[PDB]
Amino acid sequence: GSSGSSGLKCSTVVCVICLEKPKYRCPACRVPYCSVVCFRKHKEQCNPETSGPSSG
Ligand SMILES: [Zn+2]
Ligand SMILES: [Zn+2]
Numbered sequence: 001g002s003s004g005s006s007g008l009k010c011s012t013v014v015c016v017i018c019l020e021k022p023k024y025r026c027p028a029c030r031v032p033y034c035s036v037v038c039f040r041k042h043k044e045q046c047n048p049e050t051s052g053p054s055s056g
Contacts, residue, residue: 026043
């Protein structure tokens with residue numbers, strides 16, 4: 001009467017613009033983007049990982 005198995009799973013993300021199978025990512029913030037189009041509206045306010053402690 002005891003168990004402890006963690007269903008090994010992976011993380012899947014989708015374009016943060018249209019939410020579709022991202023073919024490429026931003027060479028800055030590394031965001032999911034299908035085509036340049038979706039990347040356009042992004043680049044505008046593309047905010048990469050700011051220097052210093054942010055996430056961890
Ligand atoms: Zn997209
Ligand atoms: Zn970016």
